[PDB]
RNA sequence: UUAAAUCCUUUAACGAGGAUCCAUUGGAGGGCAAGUCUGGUGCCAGCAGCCGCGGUAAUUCCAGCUCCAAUAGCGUAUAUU
RNA sequence: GAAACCAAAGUCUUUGGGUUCCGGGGGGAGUAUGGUUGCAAAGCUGAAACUUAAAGGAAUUGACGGAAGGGCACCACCAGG
């Protein structure tokens, strides 16, 4: 009666992770991500979009 | 069943799919489920979660990062 | 006037069976 | 507790129990009533030279055996009063590695001190993890030919390059005599690691080997096996299994002297009749006028790659889609799918165990309940104890019916070792075996392929069916084996009573085995259903509210009459069935429980149970010394 | 340098364009920073300290992408404040 | 003061008049066991293993009443066709 062991990992459709350029490290991954939030500011009228909005 | 003092335990195995890596009589390490003593969630009456079987632990068996000996 | 269910009344439970090893 | 003084009293009672069970289980490896520790030495890199590693091993005492190809020694001390007996694998050759790997009582790994191991020494790695690990001992060769500047990092680099394999295990280095006696002292005094599969049966490594033939036309004749004993006590009457060349009879046992004791003719049992074991694998016993129609009467090289490409395509359309089958046009449903039968829920809709059985299961051997035998024949060997010859006695063994093909290999340099069965372990039945895939080989391996077996001490071809890992009493087929998950493997095979390790290997090219799987063996059963499932998928193509008519999923009237009774599903959910078929052609009447979309799928599954093919073989071929490609 | 060395420090020669000399570990419903994105699953497998999610449109499972936190470290178990 | 309420249930983060018993999330349980008292019934003293995410208190609205009174309709009845 059921009780499968990993039905669901081993059903899912196997897809490849994707061959992305390396991220900066250190020092220079906190300036990138304070220019982002605090250098470059976009105005927006009542700011409901945060960092990952997708749609 | 406990090596050091011989007392049974009902011990949770976390992860799907992890359980096909447990097989009979091997040696299995255990640490508490987080609660200090008392039953962590849906489980009723498990304290415990199995966090290496055959001295590999069951994180690198599920991410694949090594192999178990018997 | 057969169908995919009422067929199965036609199998016989009783024929190949393997030996069987008491206990 | 109370009272302290008592409280410590029970701690110094349960100190003095453990420990004369300890004294107990390290009297029986390597000493004068024990039989000799065998280590078995693997260099796992292909730049490390064996022989002059083991000219400093070889210093006690040493009595050189000898063969045709394989060069092994036996050492003898009181200087650490222990005996052992050293055996030469090369990593590569599968046979060899795997059969005196499973006797061995210790592994020595021998490392490049520069990178950790060979390619091929992972591969032999993977099968010696998986077909069972002894107590194992790393040691490496090359750090003192070095600066020392060199010789930290190199230490501090093998020390990393190892723990994806041994995690926290000291590697030991070997240069000079005294630490060929550091070495020696360490293996001798370890715990011990017990494999299960060489304790409840009774084994036999061969020391030495004669052959006398009753008639050397016939091929055939009596032969010598002389070695220590080392499982359990060795009854006569109990057959014999020669590891490659399969299981028979032995008909006497004797004790000469032992030639080589720690510290410095006989016929023992001959076997009765009625009490002796038969060698049975199988089972023995099998008004009309002349133009009207009846409408009117009422009233009255490259293409063993193009399979490659076509089991590649195969493999990625049976994941996609797992189980769907395009229905034919051309034969008619009811007869193409005309053992099949569908079922109202997998889980709890009845199927008998015994309803339809092929020929093949007429051949073969069912158990009562097979965990009150395995418990009775388990407590059988542990706890009453037999007039055989005990464990340690050096003893030569007269087996009766066996072919020449043995003794020359013997001669060629393949260690022959012998295992005394359990009662009801020649006899044929349907092993059940829960397997997982190598992440070494990516090759697609389809359901009634021949792969070759090794399942605890045996070694076969054999064609599995895979099945779901579930708890239910139906399982349903698997018509590929899934990278990641575990599956059953599923084939008519001598009966082996668990625990034993499984491993599935596959015939490459040019005599190459790859290892395609590993696991274990789970109980034995014919009683196992396994169900091949086809799904069947139309069209619905006239949605109203709650009803549809839906083509493309058969093809005839009747077709749809035939499946009438079997439930529809639906991609998006919905759950319904056949009403009517409306045209001459598979269209179809089919009420649901709710509104279908327009981009929706109707399907239906049907269910036939599958068996094994009997195509068992106990004769595999002998690899070539494995690489990569 | 030191008993003799190793390491550090001082110094020649060689040593850097992103397919390298390639940063991890945990998370992304609330508490609590960070997605109502796409595929799979369909009260199953699983997650979830707690509230809870999963029974055919899953912000929570398994994945892909993306983002968040700390960072040569970051998770878990336990005792203790 | 949580309020209902309370000239005490006040003089309390502006917290100290003297002193006695006594509680510490719900159960297991005022149970077991030991002691003691009693002719007995029982009384006094009184656990733990285990189990559980709420039990509880004061107020506030009013689904549905098998709660009660009224009004209306030949798609309700009465007398009929």
Same mark, same amino acid.
């Given at each position: ?55 | ?70 | ?23 | ?366 158990? %009562? ?229 327009? %981009? ?30």
């Amino acid at each position: 009666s059921l009780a499968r062991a990993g039905k669901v990992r081993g059903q899912t459709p196997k897809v490849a992770k994707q061959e992305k350029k390396k991220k900066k490290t250190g020092r220079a991954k906190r300036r990138m991500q304070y220019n982002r939030r605090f250098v470059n500011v976009v105005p927006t009228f009542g700011k409901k979009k945060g960092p990952n909005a997708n749609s | 069943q406990l090596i050091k003092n011989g007392k049974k335990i009902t011990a949770f195995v976390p992860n799907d799919g992890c359980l096909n890596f447990i097989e009979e009589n091997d040696e299995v390490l255990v640490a508490g489920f987080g609660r200090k003593g008392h039953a962590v969630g849906d489980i009723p009456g498990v304290r415990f979660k199995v966090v290496k079987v055959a001295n590999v632990s069951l994180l690198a068996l599920y991410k694949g990062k090594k192999e178990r000996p018997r | 006037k057969w169908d995919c269910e009422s067929i199965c009344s036609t199998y016989s439970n009783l024929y190949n069976h393997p030996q069987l090893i008491k206990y | 507790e109370l009272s302290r003084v008592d409280q410590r009293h029970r701690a110094s009672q349960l100190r003095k129990q453990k420990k004369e069970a300890v004294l107990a289980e390290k009297r029986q490896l390597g000493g004068k009533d024990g039989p000799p520790h065998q280590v078995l030495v693997v260099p796992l890199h292909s730049r490390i030279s064996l022989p002059e590693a083991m000219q400093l091993l070889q210093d006690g005492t040493v009595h050189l055996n000898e063969l045709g190809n394989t060069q092994n020694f036996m050492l003898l001390c009181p200087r650490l009063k222990h005996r052992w007996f050293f055996t030469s694998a090369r990593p590569g050759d599968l046979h060899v590695v795997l059969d005196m790997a499973k006797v061995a009582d210790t592994i020595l790994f021998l490392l490049d001190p520069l990178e950790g191991w060979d390619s091929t020494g992972d591969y032999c790695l993977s099968c010696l993890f998986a077909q069972g690990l002894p107590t194992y001992t790393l040691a490496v060769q090359g750090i003192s030919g070095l600066p020392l500047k060199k010789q930290i990092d190199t230490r501090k680099k093998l020390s990393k390059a190892v723990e994806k394999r041994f995690p926290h295990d000291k590697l030991l280095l070997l240069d000079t005599q005294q630490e060929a006696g550091m070495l020696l002292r360490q293996l001798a005094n370890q715990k011990q690691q017990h494999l299960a599969f060489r304790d409840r049966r009774a084994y036999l490594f061969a020391h030495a080997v004669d052959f006398v033939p009753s008639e050397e036309n016939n091929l055939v004749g009596t032969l010598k096996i002389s070695g220590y004993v080392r499982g359990q006590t060795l009854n006569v009457n109990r057959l014999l299994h020669i590891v490659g060349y399969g299981d028979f009879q032995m008909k006497q046992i004797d004790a000469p002297g032992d030639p080589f004791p720690l510290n410095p003719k006989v016929l023992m049992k001959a076997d009765p009749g009625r009490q002796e074991s038969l060698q049975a694998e199988v089972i023995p016993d099998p008004k009309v006028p002349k133009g009207t129609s009846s409408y009117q009467a009422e009233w009255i090289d490259e293409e063993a790659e193009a399979k490659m490409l076509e089991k590649y395509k195969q493999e990625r359309l049976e994941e996609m889609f797992p189980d769907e089958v395009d229905t034919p046009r051309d034969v008619a449903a009811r007869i193409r799918f005309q053992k099949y039968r569908g079922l109202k829920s997998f889980r709890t809709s009845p199927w008998d165990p015994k309803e339809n059985l092929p020929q093949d299961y007429a051949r073969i051997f069912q158990f %009562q309940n097979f965990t009150n035998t395995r418990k009775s024949i388990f407590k059988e060997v542990e706890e009453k104890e037999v007039e055989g010859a005990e464990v340690g006695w050096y003893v030569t063994l007269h087996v009766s019916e066996v072919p020449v093909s043995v003794v020359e290999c013997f001669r060629q340099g393949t260690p022959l070792i012998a295992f005394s069965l359990l009662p009801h372990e020649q006899k044929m039945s349907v092993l059940n075996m829960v397997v997982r895939r190598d992440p070494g080989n990516t090759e697609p391996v389809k359901a009634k392929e021949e792969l070759i077996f090794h399942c605890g001490f045996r070694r076969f071809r054999a064609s599995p069916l895979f099945s779901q890992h579930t708890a239910a009493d139906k399982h349903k087929l698997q018509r590929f084996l899934t990278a990641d998950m575990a599956l059953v493997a599923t084939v008519y095979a001598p009966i082996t009573f668990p625990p034993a390790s499984v491993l599935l290997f596959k015939q490459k090219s040019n005599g190459m085995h790859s290892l395609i799987a590993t696991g274990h063996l789970m109980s034995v059963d014919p009683d196992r259903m396994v169900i091949k499932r086809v799904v069947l998928s139309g069209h619905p193509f006239k949605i109203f509210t709650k009803m549809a008519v839906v083509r493309y999923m058969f093809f005839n009237r009747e077709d749809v009459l035939w499946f009438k009774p079997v439930e529809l599903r639906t991609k998006w959910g919905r759950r319904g069935h056949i009403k009517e078929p409306l045209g001459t052609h598979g269209h179809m009447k089919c009420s649901f429980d709710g509104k279908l979309k327009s %981009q929706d799928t109707v399907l239906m599954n049907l269910y036939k149970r599958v068996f094994p093919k009997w195509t068992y073989d106990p004769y595999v071929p002998e690899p070539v010394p494995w690489l990569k490609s």
